[PDB]
Each structure stands twice: as structure tokens, then as C-alpha cells.
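Batch 3, record 17
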Amino acid sequence: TQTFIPGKDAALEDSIARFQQKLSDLGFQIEEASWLNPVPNVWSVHIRDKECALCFTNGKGATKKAALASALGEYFERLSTNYFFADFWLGETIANGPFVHYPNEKWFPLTENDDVPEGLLDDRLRAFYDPENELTGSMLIDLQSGNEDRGICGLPFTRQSDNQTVYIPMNIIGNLYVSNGMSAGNTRNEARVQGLSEVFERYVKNRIIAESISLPEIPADVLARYPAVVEAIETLEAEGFPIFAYDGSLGGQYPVICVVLFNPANGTCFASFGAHPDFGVALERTVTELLQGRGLKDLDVFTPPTFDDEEVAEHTNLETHFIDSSGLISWDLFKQDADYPFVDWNFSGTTEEEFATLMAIFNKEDKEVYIADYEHLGVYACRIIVPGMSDIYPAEDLWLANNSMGSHLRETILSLPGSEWEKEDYLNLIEQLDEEGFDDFTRVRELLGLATGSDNGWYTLRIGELKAMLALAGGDLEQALVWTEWTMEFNSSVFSPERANYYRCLQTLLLLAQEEDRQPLQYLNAFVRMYGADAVEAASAAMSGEAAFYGLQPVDSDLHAFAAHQSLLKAYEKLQRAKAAFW
Amino acid sequence: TQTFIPGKDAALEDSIARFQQKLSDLGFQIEEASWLNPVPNVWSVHIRDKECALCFTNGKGATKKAALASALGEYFERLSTNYFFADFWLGETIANGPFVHYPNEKWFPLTENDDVPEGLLDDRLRAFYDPENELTGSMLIDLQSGNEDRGICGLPFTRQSDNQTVYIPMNIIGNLYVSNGMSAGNTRNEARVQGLSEVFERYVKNRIIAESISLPEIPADVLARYPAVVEAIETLEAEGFPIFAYDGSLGGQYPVICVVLFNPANGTCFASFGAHPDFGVALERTVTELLQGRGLKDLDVFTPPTFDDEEVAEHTNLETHFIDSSGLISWDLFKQDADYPFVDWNFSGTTEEEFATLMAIFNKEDKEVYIADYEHLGVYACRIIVPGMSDIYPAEDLWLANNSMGSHLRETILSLPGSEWEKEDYLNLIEQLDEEGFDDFTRVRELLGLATGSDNGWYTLRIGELKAMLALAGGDLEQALVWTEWTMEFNSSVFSPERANYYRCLQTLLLLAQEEDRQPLQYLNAFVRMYGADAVEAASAAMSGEAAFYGLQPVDSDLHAFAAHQSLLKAYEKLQRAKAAF
Ligand SMILES: Nc1ncnc2c1ncn2[C@@H]1O[C@H](COP(=O)(O)O)[C@@H](O)[C@H]1O
Ligand SMILES: Nc1ncnc2c1ncn2[C@@H]1O[C@H](COP(=O)(O)O)[C@@H](O)[C@H]1O
Ligand SMILES: [Mg+2]
Ligand SMILES: [Mg+2]
Ligand SMILES: [Mg+2]
Ligand SMILES: [Mg+2]
Ligand SMILES: [Mg+2]
Ligand SMILES: [Mg+2]
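Prediction for the assembled complex:
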């Protein structure tokens, strides 16, 4: 059986078999973990690496096959772009090895005035990321390596207008574009059309949301051309979820559809977006995205619409929409009168024509397009950057919210368990954290790029809690109390029972230490009965300054102490081998 | 079969059969709803009136029979004292009828200077409740009648020192003593001993908690005398709950035990208290109270101990402990060194001797004891007041937290649905509520004494929400918005889905009304698809001022609009008949 769906350059069954066989060849054991089919003609599936819990993707589509091909395609997309590893430091060995990201990557050493080395970027890119000329080189060290001595790692992208290779720092790519504009496919142009369409989806989505645009409805006689989608919608409506199907082309300019679901049970809406040169493919994607990974009982996590236009335009609201679509939407979307008339648009053709048709729209926007091609995993994948259209985070984040900002503290923080510094050093580090302006809520593991696993204290450790630990090690019991209370107020819910119990104990002991007229020995039996001897022992050891870093095991520079991180590195090595062999 | 337990003047099976037969004779159909036996020698049971959801009690004891006799006894205690009705207005007919509470009640009309009429209370009681002489008569109108014209309803109690009848206003009783010191029993003295012991329990409990007293442990060789209790405690400890068994006699003065449970899973404690002249009976009650209505998975609702002395002593903390025992306990309770030595105390004997022994302790405290006797339901019951010992709430509450404080607004508020006042009258009522200083969080149904039932908007209506409704009826859409947001912030969780939906709709419309550059008709179709046509219609009708009191049905003066309240009155009429006949 061979099923050819609109817009794909191969049959579903062929894609599936091919992708499955290649994953296996590369040494990946991928399992399908759960399947959903919540309404007619809407499927989703979750797939994951049996040997690495951090690596998974999700599929979506109008049939079970289409969803599986989608999951597997996304798997190749994320593998090819190293995206599963993007939020992690990959250790000292990988950092100093032949190549960190790709064999054709280029390292640009830091300059003495700490300017951005000349061979990176190009003029338009410099003007777009750094209109102030305030970028330094040392801010652009990639999270994965953390290797300041080796310098700024740049990845090669082909500038489409003149076919020139341009090196864009991993740091800029990782922070500003994340997973937007990546793609994999049966062919080069199928993949590229999907990636370019994704750029349109998110860019136009952001305009629609941020500008509180009222969109025009897709007339019923147009929807009737796509009965599989009409069935899905009718079912949703029968199940108590009103659906609004909108043309998001903004007057026929962009190949974008918007579909909005209401949940009357809680007064909320959920706006989904999709793009493709073919109107029906775009419409379908939008609906299948809506329900991805959601049954009809999982539609309860969204937000009511609002009249507050400023809050809807806030870039953080657009970021939230990217992360989980639970951002704010203006009531103006659902106005009777649309700000653009409906257009029954069509940009469809062969995958070759579609690529040229979409590039013509970027050319007309006067927006340069940069494409990196990847074929080292035996499937075509790409990553497309369009500065000023495909960005997910604003360029100011390179200064304000850079994911490699805490690299320079990694070695120090990982050395704390078993450290034997002078008290003042521990207290000084508290001040350094404050002066460097880290949010107390930041997860240390995210700040340092650690796949800690779930069964130790690093998993849940936030800056605030670290400050508690440093206060204890440093002998400042008043600061210890402040940050121990903070810790419990904002984390007790996610601690294991053992760790929560330790913290109740420790807090009780710290409160007692502030009771000048009370004798600790009078309470000891009661403390032992409430908290257990072990916790009373550990907590007292923390208060003496002897073992303040409770539940934090020592961590080496290749993260051997974290089984989860080891599983991540083993997954990476599979990719490293593939890269070495392809280049 | 006949089972006699320590301290009771009749066999469990005799009490059970007797109490069951009498309830049936009086017209009450009582069912046993749920039974628990969470550890050995600890039982509890919940019983309720099949025809009135608001009437139920709970039993506890060391055996199933003992727990059933306890439930039924408590049933007679609460029926005899009218306590099931204590938080409700009983309507116009009852208010104006031959008698509201008892045939031997006395009504004292209000005076011209609004002093407290002379025949009420006695000199000591006046000095205790009103040391500054600031009590007025009009503040002592009983919640049940609300009948200011008829005056202050006083109930007769017998002062024990000289056997004189003294009339204590229902209002003072209801606000300050609640259910503390009531009792029923197989005999007059068995009941009275239980009631006096309860006064000791709660008075000593409050001292122990409020003063952060470290109590002494009951030595193991004493506990061994009561193996049924020891088995219960060992089981609890094996199940992961450390138990502290303390002597709470404060140096042998009072017949009180304290038992504390720790829940290490939570870091919390739960202190229980119990009293009786027999040390073993007191100990057992304390443990059986601990687990009443709780399985081993229901020990998760308590609070950690604290070092904050002031917060523990706060009277609101002691009130909380009375209401659900979830108040704060000082860590000092669990200190190694006790503030009193253990005393292996014993005040036991016959119920007659026990009554005299306990009265001797009150005589020594120089605390007068007042006792009302009730036998109109065919079972002896009593209610005992010991001013300065049995009080649950402080006398200042007669001024600051009086449960009849909102009676004068009842007629007005109940008339609001379907009312057709001028806008300004609605807004004026908002100001009146503010100026009278009612908390926005107060439930209107509690303020007015309404058994609303759970299926209408009166059930969940708080002052803040009433202000939203008045703002709408009065045409003030800015105030309407403020209080509509307050309403959802603090009540949406307990609204029915239909009511919550109505409030999301209304709030959306009130926000839209503040948007000067937006046209409402542009959003209508979206509003109908989100909220339904009915809610859009009801919310707009509220915003026009035409039907602002959404989900509040009109209420007549006999509360016919509330089925639940009708079921309450029918239960009360069964008691009225019994009273008249006795
Ligand atoms: N039938 C297919 N054959 C090959 N690749 C696919 C197919 N469907 C989706 N993909 C790729 O899988 C990823 C996720 O697909 P989607 O879930 O449709 O956004 C993207 O890289 C797609 O371009
Ligand atoms: N056999 C009995 N057992 C327990 N309580 C009884 C009995 N006969 C009457 N009572 C009364 O039952 C009510 C509640 O009992 P308790 O649950 O022990 O506090 C109190 O008013 C007791 O005085
Ligand atoms: Mg996807
Ligand atoms: Mg994608
Ligand atoms: Mg519209
Ligand atoms: Mg009870
Ligand atoms: Mg009682
Ligand atoms: Mg003690």
C-alpha cells in the first residue's frame, strides 16, 4: 500500500520504513510510546529513545501513518540539528575534541579588545543583532562546549541570494531561533518548503497575536473541499468545543491558516497556526497541531481572551505562545468584521516550484534567507534562519537572557559538594550571584546545562536554594533561614518526600537557633520522632557548616555523576560517529 | 447481652435500644451513615436525620456499641438543647409563636435607655460579661427569633451554689458557649459528670495550648493498666504515627489527659484532649476523639508545631482548635522537661460521688456553675455554663462578632430579588454595609441564618458579591467590576459550573464596558459561543440593572423558598410538639 498525501515527495509507508531502518542503522532504538486519535482524521504519537529519556519527539497528521511519519521526520530534524542537546553542556572531553557541533564548524578565537571576530556574520546580520555595536566576543561562547579558550564556534549557513557561506555563532542560533525553521524530509525541497512554511507560520502568528488582528473566516463552501478536516471540526463542536477557522494570509500575502478552539467549561481559547503553500495542507496541519498529544479531556490548560492590547503584544507573551501556546489572545481576533478580506489563496505546485514561490515572498520582504543543509544521518534535514522573520527571542536576549551566561560559574558550583573553603568564600559567592543578577528562581541545572536525572538534589536546585546552602557552609544562619524558607515556599512541592522532610527539619532547627531563650536539647527527642534520626543528623551537619550541600553529589567535568547526562553523551557519540564518517 | 463500661449508669445495649425507640417515637428517622474502626479498640460512626441534612452527630468509643451509644447520646444532647438550629433564623411564624426556644423561657422587653433589663443575669455574670457597663439590650436579641419587639429571650439556668433560677439571654449562650458543656445520659448524674468533665477538658486544653505548657508523659506502667488503649497506640506507631501520651492534670488539679499524634510525612501534629474522673476513661476518650471520623489516610489536615508564643495564645487560635483542632501547638509541649510532674490521679466513684467531686473543684476555683436541665425528649440532657471556665469565645465578641449582628438587615436583603428601588437606594446599601463594618468575606447565609441548600446563589453569596449585585442594580459599573473581580477571585472555585460561567461572562462584559474604543456588537457572536446565549442574556440583564441578583430567588419570611430550611423547620416542629407536651 502506498499513500500519497498532498505536499510530500514520497509515500507514507516508504518514509516510515526508510526512517525506521536508518535510525536502527545509526544505533538508535526508538519506541512508539503512546497514540491518540481524539477525533476523526486527527492522530498524534509520541516517540522516544529507549536509551535516552531526554530524546523524544511527537508526530501529528490526518492518519496514523501520517502521524508516525511526522514523528520520525521530527526525530531526524532534531537529531540532524543536534537540537536534543541544545540545552546541555556536553562536558570537557567533547569540548576539546575534534569538533563539538559539526566537522565543518569554525572556531574564532577571542580578540584582545573582545570585539566580535571579523569572519563571523555579515553586515546585515551585525546591524540586526547589534545595532549599538555593543556585542562582545566572550558573550557568544556556545553552551555545549563552554570553551572560551577555543573561542566562538560558528556554524556555516548558505546565504541564498549569492550562495555564500556565512558563519553564525552557535550561541546566537541557540538563543534566538531555537527549533524554529528546522526541517527534515523525503527530499531537499520537500524539507525546505516545510521549513520555510514554518517560518511563515510563526512570523505571521506573532503578527496576528501581537497586533490584535481580526481575521476573516474561511467560508463554509471552501471548508467543504476538505471533508476530513470538516469532520474533525464538527466532532469537536459536537463535543462542546466551538471552532473558528480563519484565513491568516493577511490579504493573500502569506500561506497561513489560524484555527481557534474555545472551551466554554473554563472560558478559555486556544489559537493554533499552520502553514503550507497548499491551502488544505495548511488547514489540516493547523487542526492536527491543535490536538497533538491532547485528548478531549486535556483542553483545560489555556487562557481566557483579553482586551489588554499591550499585554498581548509583550514579547514574553509571544514567547509563551511559542513554548506552549498558553499565551494571551485578544478578543479582537474574534470580531465580526475582519481586518483583511478572506482570500482563497494557493501557492501550491511541485516541491521545487513551492521552494521558489516561497523564496520570492522573502525576496519581496527584502529578508535574506540562510540555510544549513544536513545529510549526515542519511536523511535530508535543514535549518533556516531569516533574521527579522524567523526569530523567536529578541536580540537583546543575547545580553539579558543568554543561555551560556552561567558557564563561567560551572566549575565553581560543581566543586561545592566536598569543598572545604573558608566561610567567607561561601558568603562571597552569594554576593557574586546577586551582583551578576541571576534570578533566585533559576534552576542551577538549566543555568549550567546539566542532565541531572530526577533522583538527586541537583534536579530541583534553584539559585535561592543554593544561597541557603552557601549561607550554611559560610556560617550565616540568618541568611540560611531566609533562603531555607524561600526554598520550602517555592520548591517543597517538587522535592521527594525524603528531601522535603529534610527541609522541614532544617527549617525547624534554624528557627530554633533564633530562639535565644530556648534550649535545643529540650526538643531533640521530639525532633527525632517528627523528622527521623537521619534527617536530624544531616540537618545538624548542615548547620555546623560541615555538610551544607545536602543531596548534591560531587560532579566531574564529564558529568559521570549523572547517569542521565551519560545517556545523553552516549546518544551524542552516535551522532559524532555519523558526522565523522559523512565528512 | 449486657455490656457495662466504666463511668456509665446503664448497659450499652439498653441505652442503644432506649435511644433508638425514643427517637422513633418523637418522629425522627435516624440512619447510621458510615462506620470506622481504624485501629484496635477505636470506633466511630456518623449518624443523621434522613429528613434533614443539617442534623447529624458523630459517635466514638472503644467498641462498636459504645460508639453507637455515643452518637445517639450526642443526638439527644443536641436535640434537647436545640443546638442543630443555633446558627439559623427560624422564621416569622416561629418568632411570634407561643415560645421560640422553650415554654419556660422568659422575654424581657427592651428599655427606653436600652440598658439590659434588670431580671436578666446576676451580679457576677454582669461583671464578667460587661466589666465596663457598655452592654445594651438591643445587641442581645436571639438569632433564632430576631424579634426585637418581643425583646431579649432569656433561658432559665439553676445556679448551683444556692439553687436559684437565673435567666441568661440566648444570645450570650449561643455566642460564647456554643456546644461546650452540653451533655445527655442514661441518668442525671452520668450526664452531668460528662458535661462538667467537658468543661474541664476545654478549659485545661486552652491553658495548655495558650501557655505553651510542657506536659509530663504517662509512664509506661500506668499505661499498661489500659491494654485496649495501649494496643491502639502501638498500632498507630507501627503505622508511622508517633504518639505522645501526656498527663494534663497540671499537677493533679484537673481530670484531664492530652494525647498528641505526629505525622512525619507532613511535619504536622494533632493534639487531642479528654476528661473524666476515671483516669482510664479520660485517656480512652482522648484517643478515641483523635481518630473520630478519620481513617489512617485522613491524618493529613493538621499543622506543624511552632515556636511563636503569641500566635499560639491568640484567642482565634484557640477558637480554631475548638472548631477543628487544626490550630497551632507550641513545640514546648514536647520538651523533655515537663512543667508539672506526672500524677497518677483518680477522682472516680459512682456518678453521684463524681458529680460532687467535680463541683468541689469548681467551688475551690470560686467559679459559679449554672445548669439547665432538659427531660422533654424522654432522655436527660443538660447544659452547663461556668463563666470564666467554660467560655469558648471571649465576652468582647458580644460587641465585635455577634451572630445576630445582621438580623436588622435580613428583611432588606431578602427583598432584593425582584426589588424595584431607585438606583441610589442600591448604592446606599453598599455604603451602609461598609459603614456597619461587615467583612466582605462573610457569608450572607451565615450572617442571616439561612439554610439555603446548595443549589442556588444564596449558598455561596458573600458580602463582596452582594456589593457587586447592588452596584449593578444601582447602575455603578465601575464598582460592579471591582466586586465582580473580587467575587471570582475568592469564590469561582465553589460556584456550580453554570454560576461560574455566568460570572466569567459578566466580568467579560464589564471589562468591555470600560473599553471606550470598542463596539460591543463586534464581540457578541464570540460571547455567545464562549458563554452560551442564556448567560449572555442574564449578564446583560444584570448590567441594565433589571435582574442584578442573579441566581438569588425571592425569600419569604418563613423561608419557603429554601427546601433545606423547610426541612429544618419541620425538624424543629417535632421538638416544639415535644416541648409543649412535656
Ligand atoms: N510524510 C513525511 N515524510 C517525511 N518527512 C516528514 C513527513 N511528515 C513530516 N515530516 C517532517 O517531520 C517534521 C515534523 O512534521 P510536522 O509534524 O508535520 O510539523 C518536519 O521536519 C517535517 O518536514
Ligand atoms: N452509653 C453512652 N455512651 C456514651 N455517651 C453516652 C451514653 N449515654 C449517653 N451518652 C452521651 O453521649 C454524648 C457524646 O458522647 P461522647 O462521644 O463520649 O462525648 C454525651 O452527651 C454523653 O454524655
Ligand atoms: Mg512538531
Ligand atoms: Mg517543525
Ligand atoms: Mg475575526
Ligand atoms: Mg463528639
Ligand atoms: Mg460533648
Ligand atoms: Mg513535655
